[PDB]
Design a protein around this ligand. Structure first.
Ligand SMILES: Cc1ccc(-c2cccc3cc(C(=N)N)sc23)nc1N
Ligand SMILES: Cc1ccc(-c2cccc3cc(C(=N)N)sc23)nc1N
Ligand SMILES: [Ca+2]
Ligand SMILES: [Ca+2]
Ligand SMILES: [Cl-]
Ligand SMILES: [Cl-]
Lengths: 7, 229, 229, 7
């Protein structure tokens, strides 16, 4: 699964 | 709501405490209460809001994926479907709550690029999460995510440098939207590459600390490009 | 309660699904509903009940420790105390719920050693969790934990072999009670050592799989003895 | 902190 923005 | 009697400053203080205690449901309720005071949010406060709800919906998404996988296997009693539906409904309620805060009235009062892009990106993100569980209506949800991301992109390209972390995280998530939701892997790859290359060319303008912030997000663009190609 | 309309078998099935999805609040609510059907619980069902509530109260304990540490530093506005109190009250409510299920009516219907020891140990555990946050009343809570553990120990020594995993986990947790709650580190060390040595001497009677189960718990006794001496 | 029984 693609990586989205992290905190 | 139940936070109507608590001071705004106390809600923010308790949101930060809840983060330290990894109590993200509490953190989200505190930040929802802070938003409902009606004042605009500072940069730090916007990020507290995002962190809280991202953690809540992230747990729900992970659970939904587990249950949906079990459900799909069983179709290769009603309990698996029922419980997947329960989690799904809770997830949709969280997304609706966030979208409601953005619509009443965070976005309309956001005039600076850093706030307006942040909120429009958030609107894209939570419609994307709704899209992940949507079945057929899925089309109008996808279009709503696309529209919010696109407006955010247009502002960010006009008003922010290519290394701005909000601009980078927006482009990252819009590329994920293209690849995972919109069945547009070529658009995803093109966006990730152009975003990465334009940020690379702007790094020379940055301090050491800003350089660290920007390159951390760029690495996620690169990791996706590795997975996608 | 809200689970009164769901079949017992469906509640158990959904508890297992919630475990797979790491939805431990749901898992606990499902198992509370199953208990409230009034039938005794099987070995597997008892462990589902324990896993669910251990995970719920474990998150609350971890949060309470973070907040209490912040609170104690601040005493070296009312928000830190207020929020620690909020988490504390929620934790106490979870413990009270579990203790209520044991008292109405799991323990009184439990006649076999494996069920009765399991439930009495659980009663000790949740009074111990109450003791961790109790201040002065703390004495009567500590005595209730001690009494439950002691009754469980007496039955386990009469009715179970020294390698029985329930007997081992009981002795482990009673040793933690002695060290952490009762200010009796020598009693804790003595209990851990005697428990470990008597289990060691019984390992030769076990199958490969039972040997693995028992030695895993024995390792925790040994790890505590290393920390305590 | 002492180790208690695990799941
Ligand atoms: C004063 C200030 C401004 C911005 C931020 C910030 C920026 C991007 C992400 C993030 C996550 C945060 C959190 N998980 N609490 S703060 C934060 N932080 C500050 N202290
Ligand atoms: C048929 C059966 C009997 C007992 C157990 C059992 C025993 C000790 C701990 C534990 C945790 C469990 C869980 N986290 N679901 S089951 C379980 N399991 C079975 N399948
Ligand atoms: Ca191509
Ligand atoms: Ca001594
Ligand atoms: Cl359900
Ligand atoms: Cl509070």
């Amino acid at each position: 699964r693609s990586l989205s923005e992290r905190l | 709501g139940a936070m109507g009697s608590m001071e705004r400053a106390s809600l923010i203080q308790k949101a930060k405490l809840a983060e330290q205690a990894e109590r993200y449901e509490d953190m989200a309720a505190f930040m929802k209460g802070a938003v409902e005071k009606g004042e605009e949010l500072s940069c730090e406060e916007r990020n507290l809001l995002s962190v809280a709800y991202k953690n809540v919906v992230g747990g729900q998404r992970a659970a939904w994926r587990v249950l949906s996988s079990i459900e799909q296997k069983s179709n290769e009693g009603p309990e698996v479907r029922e419980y997947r539906e329960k989690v799904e409904t809770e997830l949709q309620g969280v997304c609706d709550t966030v979208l409601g805060l953005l619509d009443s009235h965070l976005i309309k009062e956001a005039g600076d690029a850093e706030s307006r892009v942040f909120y429009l990106k958030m609107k894209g993100d939570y419609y994307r999460y709704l899209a992940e569980v949507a079945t057929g209506d899925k089309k109008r949800i996808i279009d709503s995510a696309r529209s919010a991301y696109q407006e955010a992109m247009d502002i960010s390209k006009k008003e922010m440098p290519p290394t701005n972390p909000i601009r980078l995280g927006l482009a990252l998530n819009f590329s994920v939207f293209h690849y995972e939701i919109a069945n547009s892997p070529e658009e995803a790859i093109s966006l990730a590459k152009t975003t990465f290359d334009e940020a690379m060319a702007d790094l020379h303008t940055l301090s050491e600390d800003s350089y660290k912030d920007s390159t951390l997000i760029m690495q996620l663009l690169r990791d996706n490009l590795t997975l996608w190609t």
